[PDB]
Design a protein around this ligand. Structure first.
Ligand SMILES: O=P(O)(O)C(O)(Cc1cccnc1)P(=O)(O)O
Ligand SMILES: [Mg+2]
Ligand SMILES: [Mg+2]
Ligand SMILES: [Mg+2]
Length: 340
């Protein structure tokens, strides 16, 4: 059961949880990858990795993915959380040069991941390994789109670095725009496509019903993370959180801000329910009697189904993962799974 302040009865009643059959092997294989790529200290991997639930988060989302696609996605997701931790620690310790150099290497590795598979920075080498595998599933046009999206994500992380080093809390609207980039909304959306085995043409994925369903799934995930990660973020001097923007710029108390974030999250669900109908009608229209139409219809339907699964996977992840359990830590500002 979930605490009342975080509970979403519509998720519990109407978004039943799903789990990909590869999850048990996924859990161990990603743990071993974190150890072998030296992305976290060995003792922290053994003590904390399974409890962080990163593989569970992906296995509740990309249902139907081939096992090797899911493995690359899960390794990438675990990497992404470690990168968020590295960025945080570079900020806390004032390592502006180390951050700048990492940022530059990630831009280069994103365009040429094979060149960086054995880089001396293990964080760069692990990024490159996951991305090179992601680049092997679909035509290079998809790879180029993933790269365009992730270049933007890296720069949003750089903006967060600047904000936190200057002590700036973004305004609410500025924050909502930035959050689509720091949460990597378009990366998770891109990854729907190798999971269903089809690169969608621009005309299909830019259809208004597809686009809006994709957006709402990610807005829910990011803002629900803001709701659940607010305690650890306040304790860690993080400034990027819708609740923090509301407290800072709209003069809300903590209780009022929690209520407002909750209401915005709830609205994503019922807006998604409306647009999902339109997205599934579009999927039906794509089934025009042709083979290609059947393929595109099935891919769109699978992708919209996984946009729905993201809601339940993110919901339960936030109650299971050790990442957010700040009340258990000796130092609330320093999670035990980060290298400090
Ligand atoms: O777990 P966290 O740190 O609350 C977070 O969700 C980590 C994260 C980063 C990017 C994508 N998904 C999760 P963040 O975005 O930093 O608020
Ligand atoms: Mg974070
Ligand atoms: Mg972050
Ligand atoms: Mg957060």
């Amino acid at each position: 059961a979930v605490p009342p302040s975080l509970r979403l009865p519509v998720i519990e009643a109407a978004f039943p949880r799903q789990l990909h059959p590869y999850w048990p092997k996924l859990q161990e294989t990603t743990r071993t990858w974190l150890l072998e790529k030296r992305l976290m200290p060995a003792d922290k991997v053994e003590e904390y990795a399974d409890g962080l639930c990163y593989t569970d988060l992906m296995a509740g989302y990309y249902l139907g993915a081939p096992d090797e696609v899911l493995q690359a996605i899960a390794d990438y997701s675990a990497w992404f959380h470690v990168w968020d931790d590295r960025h945080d620690r570079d900020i806390v310790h004032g390592r502006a040069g180390a951050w700048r150099r990492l940022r530059g290497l990630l831009h280069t590795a994103l365009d040429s991941p094979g060149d960086h598979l054995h880089h001396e920075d293990t964080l760069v080498a692990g990024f490159a390994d996951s991305v090179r595998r992601l680049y092997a599933f679909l035509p290079a046009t998809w790879n180029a789109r993933f790269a365009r999206h992730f270049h933007t994500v890296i720069e949003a992380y750089d903006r967060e670095f600047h904000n936190r080093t200057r002590g700036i809390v973004p305004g609410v609207e500025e924050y909502l725009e930035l959050r689509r980039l720091t949460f990597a909304h378009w990366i998770w959306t891109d990854l729907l496509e190798p999971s269903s085995g089809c690169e969608l043409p621009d005309a299909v994925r830019k259809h208004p019903a597809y686009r809006r369903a994709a957006l709402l799934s990610q807005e829910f995930a990011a803002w629900y993370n803001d709701l659940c990660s607010l305690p650890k973020e306040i304790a860690g001097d993080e400034v990027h959180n819708l609740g923090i923007s509301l407290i800072t710029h709209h003069s809300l108390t903590l209780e009022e801000a929690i209520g407002e974030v909750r209401r915005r999250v709830e609205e994503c669900i019922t807006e998604f329910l409306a647009v999902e109908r339109d997205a599934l009608r579009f999927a039906d229209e794509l089934a025009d009697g042709t083979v290609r139409g059947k393929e595109l219809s099935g891919a769109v339907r699978a992708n919209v189904g996984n946009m729905r699964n993201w809601f339940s996977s993110v919901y339960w992840f936030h109650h299971e993962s050790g990442r957010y359990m700040v009340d258990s830590w000796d130092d609330r500002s320093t999670p035990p799974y980060v290298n400090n």
